[PDB]
Design an enzyme around this catalytic site. Structure first.
Site, PDB file in Angstrom:
ATOM      1  N   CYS A  85     -29.457  23.125  -4.149  1.00 30.38           N
ATOM      2  CA  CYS A  85     -30.130  21.978  -4.729  1.00 30.38           C
ATOM      3  C   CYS A  85     -29.357  20.696  -4.374  1.00 30.38           C
ATOM      4  CB  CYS A  85     -30.319  22.137  -6.239  1.00 30.38           C
ATOM      5  SG  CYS A  85     -28.770  22.110  -7.187  1.00 30.38           S
ATOM      6  N   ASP A 107     -26.076  31.046  -3.431  1.00 32.68           N
ATOM      7  CA  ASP A 107     -26.735  30.058  -4.272  1.00 32.68           C
ATOM      8  C   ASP A 107     -25.654  29.354  -5.082  1.00 32.68           C
ATOM      9  OD1 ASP A 107     -28.623  28.526  -5.672  1.00 32.68           O
ATOM     10  OD2 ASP A 107     -29.513  30.208  -6.741  1.00 32.68           O
ATOM     11  N   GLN A 113     -33.880  29.648 -12.673  1.00 35.30           N
ATOM     12  CA  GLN A 113     -34.552  28.708 -11.799  1.00 35.30           C
ATOM     13  C   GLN A 113     -35.550  27.955 -12.664  1.00 35.30           C
ATOM     14  OE1 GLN A 113     -34.067  27.483  -8.852  1.00 35.30           O
ATOM     15  NE2 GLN A 113     -32.519  28.849  -7.976  1.00 35.30           N
TER      16      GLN A 113
END
Ligand code: NA
Length: 410
Positions: free
Chosen positions: A367, A341, A253
């Site tokens: 994202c 994710d 991250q």
């Protein structure tokens, strides 16, 4: 064409009728001189800022449309955050609140500087470019000038050719930092083997880790078969009192300062005790949750990442399980919460498996909201409904969004 910018589009470009104007923002009164066709969109090549939107930072950023560096640099920070909420809602029809980055300069813990015959730049992949000059937008490090001086010195002593876009000895300088530990990893990404061991070590004598990564193709992407040249095999980042290990071969991250906000978001949305964290990385979410008493199985395809997570667990005395594998083939039964994710391409067809075998609480970390909502519309909504959602600003001064979405079963 002259007019007032009415909105920004999904990619953060200001809209002027059927023109897209980079670095223009809602409220700007603009004048466009040259445009350029770009895959069926007309994009402004430059503009003159006639009147500044009330959203702009007063000063030079209200006189020039492009203050410099980052696409959204000229927006006041609070105003960027609201524009992120607007985009997210516009794309997903979810109203999510965003938590700002505790620190909006020098926040990234990694940078791939591309090394070209036109000199060194921050690389990003994709065409509405968002960081065009890292000298006028210092998103990475206060040491960036020292990193680049070192590289230039090394290229002098080691007579070595930059990427001329068809070939070159070296291609990228990758630097990674642990924001809360001081540790620095330097990873040269090259198309030849290392000959100037001593010159490189000397130039980067300050790094805790020096790697040399050999690319077996000519493609423009920053990855190799790494070789430790000197120092530690890994570097340490420390967040919420958890020591995480970072290897040249892994993803982590990007914003070490906003990451606590991502960790607490996911935790707030968890349900039950048995958590399955697919795409588990170098244990970022898994370790955080498990340390807080959740029973946590994490599955990640990258084997080096999975090792890093196992070692972190030992270092930190965390009780958790970590497995190499593809998320597509992990068993989903027996759990109360599932976290995903996925990469930019999304869940894709894995959604049908989640529709059938998935647990009651699904948490989706993206994202890329356009791809999220498509996964949702196309598959997940059969079984799932959105229950909650948060945004974290991991990428200040640019229009990128990090969403945490909690779905539950119907
Ligand atoms: Na920088």
């Amino acid at each position: 064409m002259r007019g007032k910018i009415t909105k920004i589009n999904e990619n953060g470009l200001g809209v002027l009728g059927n023109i897209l104007v980079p670095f223009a923002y809602p409220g700007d009164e603009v004048e466009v001189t040259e445009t350029r066709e770009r895959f069926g969109k007309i994009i402004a090549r430059d503009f003159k800022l006639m009147t500044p939107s009330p959203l702009r930072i007063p000063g030079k950023c209200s006189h020039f449309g492009k203050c410099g560096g980052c696409l959204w640099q000229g927006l006041r920070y609070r105003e960027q955050l609201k524009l992120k909420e607007e985009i997210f809602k516009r794309i997903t029809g979810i109203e999510a609140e965003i938590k700002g980055s505790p620190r909006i300069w020098y926040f990234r813990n990694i940078s791939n500087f591309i090394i070209t015959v036109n000199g060194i730049g921050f690389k990003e992949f994709g065409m509405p470019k968002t960081v065009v000059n890292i000298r006028e937008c210092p998103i990475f490090s206060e040491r960036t000038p020292k990193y680049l001086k070192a590289l230039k010195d090394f290229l002098r002593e080691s007579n070595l050719k930059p990427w001329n876009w068809r070939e070159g000895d070296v291609h990228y300088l990758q630097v990674r930092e642990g924001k809360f530990t001081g540790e620095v990893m330097v990873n040269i990404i090259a198309h030849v083997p290392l000959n100037y061991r001593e010159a490189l070590m000397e130039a980067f004598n300050f790094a805790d880790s020096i790697y040399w990564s050999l690319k077996a193709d000519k493609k423009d992407d920053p990855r190799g078969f790494p070789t430790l040249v000197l120092g530690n095999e890994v570097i340490r980042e420390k967040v919420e009192g958890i020591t995480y290990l970072i290897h040249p071969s892994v993803f982590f991250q990007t914003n070490s300062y906003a990451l606590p906000l991502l960790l607490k978001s996911v935790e707030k949305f968890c349900e039950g005790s048995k958590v399955l964290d697919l795409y588990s990385g170098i244990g970022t979410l898994s370790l955080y949750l498990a340390k807080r008493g959740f029973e946590v199985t994490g599955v990640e395809v990258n084997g080096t990442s999975v090792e890093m997570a196992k070692r972190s667990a030992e270092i930190n005395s965390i009780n958790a399980t970590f497995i190499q594998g593809k998320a597509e083939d992990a068993e989903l039964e027996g759990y109360e919460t599932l976290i995903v994710d996925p990469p930019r391409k999304g869940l894709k067809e894995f959604s049908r498996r989640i529709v059938k075998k998935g647990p009651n609480t699904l948490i989706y970390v993206s994202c890329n909201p356009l791809r999220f909502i498509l996964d949702y519309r196309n598959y997940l909504s059969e079984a799932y409904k959105v229950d909650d959602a948060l945004l974290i600003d991991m990428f200040p001064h640019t229009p990128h969004i990090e969403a945490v979405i909690k779905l539950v079963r119907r």
